[PDB]
mmCIF file of C-alpha atoms and ligand atoms in Angstrom:
data_model
loop_
_atom_site.group_PDB
_atom_site.id
_atom_site.type_symbol
_atom_site.label_atom_id
_atom_site.label_comp_id
_atom_site.label_asym_id
_atom_site.label_seq_id
_atom_site.Cartn_x
_atom_site.Cartn_y
_atom_site.Cartn_z
ATOM 1 C CA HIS A 1 75.258 -74.428 -40.702
ATOM 2 C CA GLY A 2 77.378 -71.301 -40.655
ATOM 3 C CA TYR A 3 80.629 -69.737 -41.849
ATOM 4 C CA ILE A 4 83.330 -67.628 -40.243
ATOM 5 C CA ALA A 5 82.007 -64.112 -40.796
ATOM 6 C CA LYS A 6 84.858 -62.095 -39.222
ATOM 7 C CA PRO A 7 87.399 -61.996 -40.718
ATOM 8 C CA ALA A 8 85.161 -61.730 -43.760
ATOM 9 C CA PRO A 9 85.165 -64.437 -46.425
ATOM 10 C CA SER A 10 84.779 -63.952 -50.142
ATOM 11 C CA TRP A 11 82.546 -66.253 -52.177
ATOM 12 C CA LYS A 12 83.196 -68.188 -55.422
ATOM 13 C CA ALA A 13 79.689 -69.136 -56.675
ATOM 14 C CA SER A 14 77.221 -68.163 -53.902
ATOM 15 C CA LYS A 15 77.226 -66.723 -50.441
ATOM 16 C CA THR A 16 75.829 -69.597 -48.398
ATOM 17 C CA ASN A 17 76.099 -71.045 -44.881
ATOM 18 C CA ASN A 18 75.671 -74.578 -46.288
ATOM 19 C CA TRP A 19 77.804 -77.608 -45.849
ATOM 20 C CA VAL A 20 80.029 -78.727 -48.708
ATOM 21 C CA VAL A 21 79.011 -82.392 -48.392
ATOM 22 C CA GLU A 22 76.679 -84.443 -46.196
ATOM 23 C CA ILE A 23 77.876 -88.057 -46.054
ATOM 24 C CA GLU A 24 77.645 -91.274 -44.036
ATOM 25 C CA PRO A 25 80.069 -91.579 -41.131
ATOM 26 C CA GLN A 26 83.419 -92.613 -42.629
ATOM 27 C CA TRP A 27 84.286 -94.810 -39.653
ATOM 28 C CA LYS A 28 82.310 -98.042 -39.195
ATOM 29 C CA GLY A 29 80.564 -98.217 -35.802
ATOM 30 C CA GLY A 30 77.455 -97.744 -33.700
ATOM 31 C CA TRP A 31 76.606 -94.105 -34.470
ATOM 32 C CA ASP A 32 72.824 -94.725 -34.771
ATOM 33 C CA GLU A 33 72.703 -96.863 -31.559
ATOM 34 C CA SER A 34 74.153 -93.936 -29.557
ATOM 35 C CA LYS A 35 71.887 -91.249 -28.084
ATOM 36 C CA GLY A 36 72.151 -87.482 -28.191
ATOM 37 C CA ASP A 37 74.981 -85.232 -29.195
ATOM 38 C CA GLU A 38 76.950 -86.780 -26.308
ATOM 39 C CA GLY A 39 76.611 -90.174 -27.986
ATOM 40 C CA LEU A 40 77.755 -88.801 -31.362
ATOM 41 C CA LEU A 41 80.875 -87.278 -29.751
ATOM 42 C CA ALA A 42 81.607 -90.418 -27.690
ATOM 43 C CA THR A 43 81.349 -92.610 -30.836
ATOM 44 C CA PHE A 44 83.714 -90.229 -32.655
ATOM 45 C CA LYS A 45 86.188 -90.396 -29.726
ATOM 46 C CA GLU A 46 85.953 -94.230 -29.621
ATOM 47 C CA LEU A 47 86.544 -94.693 -33.370
ATOM 48 C CA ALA A 48 89.096 -91.932 -34.015
ATOM 49 C CA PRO A 49 92.312 -93.860 -32.966
ATOM 50 C CA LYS A 50 91.592 -97.052 -35.003
ATOM 51 C CA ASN A 51 90.909 -94.726 -37.961
ATOM 52 C CA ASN A 52 94.286 -92.836 -37.567
ATOM 53 C CA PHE A 53 92.493 -89.543 -36.895
ATOM 54 C CA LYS A 54 94.772 -86.572 -36.251
ATOM 55 C CA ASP A 55 92.675 -83.435 -36.937
ATOM 56 C CA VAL A 56 89.852 -82.345 -39.230
ATOM 57 C CA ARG A 57 92.149 -80.730 -41.799
ATOM 58 C CA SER A 58 94.055 -84.051 -42.166
ATOM 59 C CA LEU A 59 90.734 -85.916 -42.504
ATOM 60 C CA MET A 60 89.352 -83.640 -45.220
ATOM 61 C CA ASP A 61 92.294 -82.321 -47.278
ATOM 62 C CA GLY A 62 92.818 -84.367 -50.439
ATOM 63 C CA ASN A 63 89.966 -86.732 -49.562
ATOM 64 C CA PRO A 64 87.447 -86.578 -52.393
ATOM 65 C CA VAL A 65 84.378 -87.549 -50.366
ATOM 66 C CA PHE A 66 84.773 -84.240 -48.479
ATOM 67 C CA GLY A 67 84.284 -82.261 -51.699
ATOM 68 C CA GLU A 68 85.748 -79.030 -53.043
ATOM 69 C CA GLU A 69 88.687 -77.349 -51.312
ATOM 70 C CA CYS A 70 87.548 -74.163 -49.534
ATOM 71 C CA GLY A 71 83.857 -75.031 -49.983
ATOM 72 C CA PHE A 72 81.918 -72.043 -51.328
ATOM 73 C CA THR A 73 84.552 -69.554 -50.181
ATOM 74 C CA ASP A 74 87.125 -67.985 -52.493
ATOM 75 C CA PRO A 75 90.770 -68.176 -51.420
ATOM 76 C CA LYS A 76 91.572 -65.678 -54.214
ATOM 77 C CA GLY A 77 89.125 -63.133 -52.786
ATOM 78 C CA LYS A 78 90.046 -59.738 -51.453
ATOM 79 C CA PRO A 79 92.168 -60.255 -48.295
ATOM 80 C CA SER A 80 90.468 -59.301 -45.010
ATOM 81 C CA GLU A 81 92.080 -57.654 -41.994
ATOM 82 C CA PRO A 82 92.628 -59.890 -38.969
ATOM 83 C CA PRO A 83 90.375 -58.968 -35.996
ATOM 84 C CA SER A 84 92.252 -56.953 -33.341
ATOM 85 C CA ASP A 85 90.821 -58.913 -30.348
ATOM 86 C CA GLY A 86 92.187 -62.436 -30.785
ATOM 87 C CA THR A 87 88.902 -63.868 -32.018
ATOM 88 C CA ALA A 88 87.139 -65.153 -35.102
ATOM 89 C CA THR A 89 83.369 -64.746 -35.216
ATOM 90 C CA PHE A 90 80.932 -67.241 -36.699
ATOM 91 C CA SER A 91 77.963 -66.130 -38.802
ATOM 92 C CA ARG A 92 75.467 -67.566 -36.273
ATOM 93 C CA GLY A 93 75.440 -69.861 -33.277
ATOM 94 C CA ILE A 94 76.671 -73.426 -33.503
ATOM 95 C CA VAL A 95 73.835 -76.012 -33.402
ATOM 96 C CA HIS A 96 75.623 -79.262 -34.342
ATOM 97 C CA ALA A 97 78.099 -81.261 -32.267
ATOM 98 C CA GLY A 98 81.563 -82.117 -33.578
ATOM 99 C CA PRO A 99 85.159 -80.968 -33.873
ATOM 100 C CA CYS A 100 86.353 -77.791 -35.544
ATOM 101 C CA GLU A 101 89.620 -75.973 -36.011
ATOM 102 C CA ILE A 102 91.220 -72.853 -37.482
ATOM 103 C CA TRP A 103 94.569 -72.766 -39.292
ATOM 104 C CA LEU A 104 96.655 -69.816 -40.480
ATOM 105 C CA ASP A 105 98.605 -71.344 -43.346
ATOM 106 C CA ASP A 106 100.253 -74.456 -41.805
ATOM 107 C CA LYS A 107 99.821 -73.313 -38.164
ATOM 108 C CA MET A 108 96.819 -74.694 -36.297
ATOM 109 C CA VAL A 109 95.763 -71.771 -34.082
ATOM 110 C CA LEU A 110 92.526 -73.108 -32.570
ATOM 111 C CA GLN A 111 91.051 -76.585 -32.116
ATOM 112 C CA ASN A 112 88.234 -78.106 -30.101
ATOM 113 C CA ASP A 113 86.663 -81.557 -30.060
ATOM 114 C CA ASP A 114 83.163 -80.059 -29.794
ATOM 115 C CA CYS A 115 82.812 -76.513 -31.034
ATOM 116 C CA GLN A 116 79.099 -76.430 -30.086
ATOM 117 C CA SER A 117 79.901 -76.627 -26.352
ATOM 118 C CA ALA A 118 83.115 -74.526 -26.487
ATOM 119 C CA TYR A 119 82.113 -71.468 -28.565
ATOM 120 C CA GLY A 120 78.388 -71.021 -28.454
ATOM 121 C CA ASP A 121 75.283 -71.658 -26.314
ATOM 122 C CA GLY A 122 73.841 -74.405 -28.659
ATOM 123 C CA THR A 123 71.346 -71.880 -30.166
ATOM 124 C CA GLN A 124 71.667 -70.419 -33.661
ATOM 125 C CA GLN A 125 70.523 -67.033 -32.205
ATOM 126 C CA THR A 126 73.661 -66.452 -30.079
ATOM 127 C CA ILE A 127 76.707 -65.680 -32.227
ATOM 128 C CA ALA A 128 79.549 -68.163 -31.695
ATOM 129 C CA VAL A 129 82.965 -66.620 -31.062
ATOM 130 C CA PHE A 130 86.177 -68.595 -31.507
ATOM 131 C CA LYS A 131 88.984 -67.677 -29.117
ATOM 132 C CA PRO A 132 91.832 -67.412 -28.583
ATOM 133 C CA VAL A 133 93.084 -66.831 -32.151
ATOM 134 C CA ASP A 134 96.614 -65.451 -32.468
ATOM 135 C CA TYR A 135 96.970 -63.864 -35.940
ATOM 136 C CA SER A 136 100.567 -62.710 -35.412
ATOM 137 C CA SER A 137 102.058 -65.211 -37.893
ATOM 138 C CA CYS A 138 100.069 -63.446 -40.667
ATOM 139 C CA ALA A 139 102.341 -60.346 -40.412
ATOM 140 C CA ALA A 140 104.902 -61.993 -42.827
ATOM 141 C CA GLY A 141 103.058 -62.023 -46.133
ATOM 142 C CA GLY A 142 99.484 -62.356 -44.894
ATOM 143 C CA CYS A 143 98.064 -65.814 -44.513
ATOM 144 C CA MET A 144 95.236 -68.039 -45.583
ATOM 145 C CA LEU A 145 92.835 -68.716 -42.724
ATOM 146 C CA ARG A 146 91.251 -72.141 -43.068
ATOM 147 C CA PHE A 147 88.271 -73.316 -41.019
ATOM 148 C CA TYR A 148 87.218 -76.954 -40.855
ATOM 149 C CA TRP A 149 84.181 -78.281 -39.024
ATOM 150 C CA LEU A 150 82.946 -81.880 -39.032
ATOM 151 C CA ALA A 151 79.368 -81.583 -37.846
ATOM 152 C CA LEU A 152 77.715 -84.744 -36.520
ATOM 153 C CA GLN A 153 73.899 -84.747 -36.873
ATOM 154 C CA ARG A 154 70.985 -87.191 -36.859
ATOM 155 C CA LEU A 155 68.559 -86.888 -39.797
ATOM 156 C CA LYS A 156 65.553 -89.176 -39.301
ATOM 157 C CA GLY A 157 67.495 -91.331 -36.830
ATOM 158 C CA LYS A 158 70.412 -91.685 -39.243
ATOM 159 C CA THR A 159 73.760 -90.148 -38.341
ATOM 160 C CA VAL A 160 75.445 -88.055 -41.021
ATOM 161 C CA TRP A 161 78.676 -86.124 -41.218
ATOM 162 C CA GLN A 162 78.447 -82.582 -42.635
ATOM 163 C CA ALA A 163 81.664 -80.920 -43.795
ATOM 164 C CA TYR A 164 82.033 -77.164 -43.467
ATOM 165 C CA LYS A 165 85.130 -75.495 -44.901
ATOM 166 C CA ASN A 166 86.141 -71.875 -45.318
ATOM 167 C CA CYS A 167 89.285 -70.304 -46.768
ATOM 168 C CA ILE A 168 89.702 -66.607 -45.880
ATOM 169 C CA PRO A 169 92.733 -64.705 -47.131
ATOM 170 C CA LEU A 170 94.094 -62.221 -44.572
ATOM 171 C CA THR A 171 96.280 -59.163 -44.966
ATOM 172 C CA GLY A 172 99.800 -58.852 -43.574
ATOM 173 C CA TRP A 173 102.131 -55.922 -42.951
ATOM 174 C CA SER A 174 105.633 -57.409 -43.721
ATOM 175 C CA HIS A 175 107.376 -59.427 -46.496
ATOM 176 C CA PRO A 176 106.831 -63.200 -46.717
ATOM 177 C CA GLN A 177 109.435 -65.331 -44.857
HETATM 178 CU CU1 LIG B 1 73.547 -77.029 -40.005
#
């Protein structure tokens, strides 16, 4: 669970830290025979090439089983100012394994194969901070920040994929290019 909280999102229907969908793994393999978060990540790594995986945005965008574009967030909301410290801040700590990434329009500015280990302490109590995030491209016209997170979790011994998506419009100081 969680959303990028800084820069601040706007909400369409409800403020919520929920996933957009919770689905079976899309890649056939031995998810449930693996153990721990390490096993979930290793299964993902093993299956990704045969499934033509590039990045989470490519996996989710236009793929109906991943649900609504932008999740619960409103891309037509009031634009937020980029943070001045090269970060984005999550709403809580990160407590599920799996890859996540941040885009500013069509520029991927941050990516990690396991955001849980990279950006938090595995507790929901400690706020996760994404860094480095270079917002400079947003000067020309602002930008849409997009966050994608494919959380891997076991629910009663059964692996699921949870999709988290945010769209956060950001301000910019100069004309579009
Ligand atoms: Cu969760």
